[PDB]
Design a protein around this ligand. Sequence first.
Ligand code: CL
Ligand code: CL
Ligand code: CU
Ligand code: CU
Lengths: 126, 126
Amino acid sequence: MAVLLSGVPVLAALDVSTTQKFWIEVLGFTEEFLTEDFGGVSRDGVELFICSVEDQVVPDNTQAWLRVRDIDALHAEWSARVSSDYADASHPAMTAIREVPWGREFGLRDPAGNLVHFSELSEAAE
Amino acid sequence: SNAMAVLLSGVPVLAALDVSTTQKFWIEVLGFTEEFLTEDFGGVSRDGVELFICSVEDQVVPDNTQAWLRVRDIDALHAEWSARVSSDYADASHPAMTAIREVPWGREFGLRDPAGNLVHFSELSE
Ligand SMILES: [Cl-]
Ligand SMILES: [Cl-]
Ligand SMILES: [Cu+2]
Ligand SMILES: [Cu+2]
C-alpha cells in the first residue's frame, strides 16, 4: 500500500555552505551532507534541505513550517543566539511568539533570507 | 534536567502564481486531502503528511522551489499517478512525472506540478 511518511522542506540560498553553517552552529541542527549546491541538516530526526539558487528573490519568497513541542523553550534556547530585531534584514532574526488560530508560533529568518515558521499546534489542531 | 524543545515534523511550502489551481491539482490529480484554502495560502495532506502552497508574483520562485516527500511503496505510488500525470518530463507545458530512478539513498521520482514546483518522492533503502 502506497503511504506518504514525512516531508522535507527545501530552503533556498545563494550560499548553501554559509546558510548551512548557521543552521548547525547557531540553531543546533546536525549536518547530514554538504555539496556546493545542496546541503542537508536535521534535528530530533526532522530533516531540512538547502539548495543553491542564482536569484535572491527566491529565498526572499521561500518559507517552511516546522512543528515543535515546547515552543517557549525553543524561543528561549535561541533568544541569546538570534537577534529579535526582525525589521533589520541585514542579519538573521526571530520574532516574538504569537497566537495563531491553530496554536502558537514564531518566525525565524535565516541568513539566506528564508522564513521558517516554528509552530506549536493546539491539541484541538492536532 | 530542564525543559528542552523537540522538533516534531516539517511542512514544505510550495510556491505558485495561482494557489487555487495548484491546490486543485494536488487534491484532484494527486489525491491529497484539503486542509484549507485562501487566496494566498492553501494546505493539503495525505497520510498525515502536510504540504502548503503560498502565492508569489514571480515565476522564477516556483521554478526554483523543491520539496522531498518520503514514501513507502514507491512503485505503487508511481502506478497510481501514471494514470493522471504525463511521463513526458521534458515538455514543460504540462505537469509531469519522471520514471523511478536509483539514487545513493534509495529510489525516487520527480514530479513537476502546474505551478512549476519540483517535488521528489523518495523511498529510502535499508
Ligand atoms: Cl510572511
Ligand atoms: Cl532539479
Ligand atoms: Cu513576507
Ligand atoms: Cu532543475
